[PDB]
Structure formats: structure tokens, C-alpha cells
Design a protein around this ligand. Structure first.
Ligand SMILES: *[C@@H]1O[C@H](CO)[C@@H](O)[C@H](O)[C@H]1NC(C)=O
Ligand SMILES: [Mg+2]
Lengths: 147, 24, 49
């Protein structure tokens, strides 16, 4: 009895964060990885295309030209579909999604320090400029399981 | 308890990340 | 069985709100009061005075 109540209200947290990042909450429910886009009261589905993999390249400046103070919230990227060789400009979404035209930018606050994981390497950006590769295994990971 | 604090990051380390670490 | 599933998806709500106010979600997990700052995909720790 008490169970379906944890269940019933924690539905309403799902509906809530769906309004923010529907990809995540939907995937969490149905377990599939599933991309999804927010639209109003009604959240549509959207399907993916896997690109060249190698190569994808991470550009070292996260400032936009022009101008300051307009800065990308995520590192910008150049990738290829394949078979093909048209060089495109995505923007490193999380969990290896490359972002078409919705460029998360986000206006220049100093001083920053964010680090972004793409594939299996972490890229530390100190002041919207790149600084160093970061050891992905150095970063301890929150285990949370109430067992 | 919950004193009047001011919090900052001293050294470079240390950082925690999330990941999908529980599997049923 | 059904338990570890409330557990598994409500991990993904934690990862989500960590991106907003990591201090809170982290404290909620580990029970300590713990300050923390958002940085990218990777959320650093920060200690108080
Ligand atoms: C795309 O991937 C193919 C497969 O390995 C590779 O031969 C090609 O050079 C890649 N293109 C670029 C621009 O890296
Ligand atoms: Mg629950």
C-alpha cells in the first residue's frame, strides 16, 4: 500500500524533470536509451543516427565569436557522418550525443571551471579555454544504492 | 551543526561524478 | 526486485538535480552535510570555513 504511494508521487517528479531533460527521465523509466525533446505539455520522441565515431574533434575555445560575453555551455565539436566527409559543427551533448543546432550557450561568467566527458576522456576547460585532459578513472563515482 | 560557513574548492582535486552504476 | 528499480531510476533523478544544486542531492545521499559545486559532467567537492 505504502509502495504505490512512493510510486504515485515519484511519478510527479518524473513529469517535472521531463520538462527539463526528457531524454534522461524517459530513459530511466523505459530503460532503453531514448532521446526525446520537450515541447509544451507533450514531449516528443525523436530518433538517432550514429556518425563516423572517429573522428569527432573537440575545439579548445568555448567562447563564441562574436561576442563575449556569449560562451558555449558545452565544448563545440566537429564530426563526420560516414560514409561521407562533410565536416559539421555539433556541440558535444552528454552521453555521446552530438548536438545539431540547439547550441547550449549560456553567457560568459568569470571565472569558470567545468570539465566535460566525451566517450572515455574528460576535458577540463578552465576559463572557457581548454587546460588539460583529465583522468576519467581519477574521478570517484557516487554509489547511492539503498540496498 | 550548520555553522556560518564559506565554502570553496581548495586544491584541484577532488571530484565526484554520477554514472549508471546500479544494475538489476 | 521491484525495489532496486525505484532505486535505479531514482538514481537518474539524483544525477539530474545534481546538475542544479549538487550540495543538496549529495548531502541527501551520503547524509553528511556536504557542500559541492557543479562543473560539467563531473561535480567537484569544495570544503568549508
Ligand atoms: C571516418 O571514418 C572512416 C572509418 O575509419 C575513416 O577511414 C575516415 O578517415 C574518417 N573520416 C575522418 C574525417 O576522420
Ligand atoms: Mg522510492
Amino acid at each position: 500500500e505504502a509502495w504505490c504511494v512512493d510510486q504515485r508521487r515519484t511519478l510527479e517528479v518524473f513529469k517535472e524533470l521531463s520538462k527539463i531533460n526528457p531524454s534522461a527521465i524517459l530513459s530511466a523509466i523505459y530503460n532503453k536509451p531514448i532521446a526525446a525533446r520537450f515541447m509544451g505539455d507533450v514531449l516528443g520522441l525523436a530518433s538517432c543516427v550514429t556518425i563516423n565515431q572517429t573522428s569527432v574533434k573537440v575545439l579548445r575555445d568555448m567562447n563564441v565569436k562574436e561576442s563575449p560575453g556569449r560562451c558555449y555551455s558545452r565544448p563545440v565539436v566537429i564530426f563526420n557522418f560516414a560514409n561521407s566527409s562533410y565536416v559539421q559543427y555539433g556541440q558535444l551533448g552528454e552521453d555521446n550525443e552530438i548536438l545539431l543546432g540547439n547550441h547550449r550557450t549560456e553567457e560568459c561568467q568569470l571565472p569558470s571551471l567545468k570539465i566535460f566527458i566525451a566517450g572515455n576522456s574528460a576535458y577540463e576547460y578552465v576559463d572557457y579555454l581548454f587546460k588539460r585532459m583529465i583522468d576519467l578513472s581519477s574521478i570517484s563515482t557516487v554509489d547511492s544504492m539503498i540496498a | 551543526k550548520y555553522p556560518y560557513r564559506v565554502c570553496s574548492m581548495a586544491q584541484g582535486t577532488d571530484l565526484i561524478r554520477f554514472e549508471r552504476n546500479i544494475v538489476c
